[PDB]
Design a binder for this molecule. Structure first.
Ligand SMILES: [Cl-]
Ligand SMILES: [Zn+2]
Ligand SMILES: [Zn+2]
Ligand SMILES: [Zn+2]
Length: 116
DNA sequence: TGCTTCCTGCCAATAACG
DNA sequence: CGTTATTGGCAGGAAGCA
């Protein structure tokens, strides 16, 4: 299913099919569904089907149009991290991955997922 | 070149086990 | 229902479009 490669005492898990390397077995497993399609993650709104549950979720948020990502400098909201970061970098000349917290991620309310 | 989607370490939430 | 296993949300850089 996989094979282990060990260099300098660090374990790596290698996919048998595409030879991708992973530091944890969970990632190797999550990844391998792309090859096996043991599990199917179908969009609840259209016909599309995904190999990872998280891919399906990001896609379903597109259907609802919910904007969970909010710029704290001007209040504008965005559907995903990428739009948010691009806005803060270009309009506000700041990096949200920096030491400062420049955005708020709202809970997902337009559909049912586990929360924090 | 700028969206659009993909990827994977991390680990909190959820579930499976028993 | 306490212990263990699995799921998948998140960041943010990569890769994939056109
Ligand atoms: Cl919203
Ligand atoms: Zn693979
Ligand atoms: Zn869909
Ligand atoms: Zn802003």
């Amino acid at each position: 299913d996989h094979y282990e490669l060990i260099v300098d005492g660090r374990v790596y898990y290698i996919c048998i099919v595409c030879k991708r390397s992973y530091v944890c077995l969970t990632s190797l497993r999550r990844h391998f569904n792309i090859h096996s399609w043991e599990k199917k993650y179908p969009c609840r709104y259209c016909e599309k089907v995904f190999p990872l549950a998280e891919y399906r979720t990001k896609h379903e948020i597109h259907h609802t149009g919910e904007r969970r990502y909010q710029c704290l400098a001007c209040g504008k909201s965005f559907i995903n991290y990428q739009f948010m970061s691009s806005h803060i970098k270009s309009v506000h000349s700041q990096d949200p991955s920096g030491d400062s917290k420049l955005y708020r991620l709202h809970p997902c309310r337009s559909l049912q997922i586990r929360q924090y």
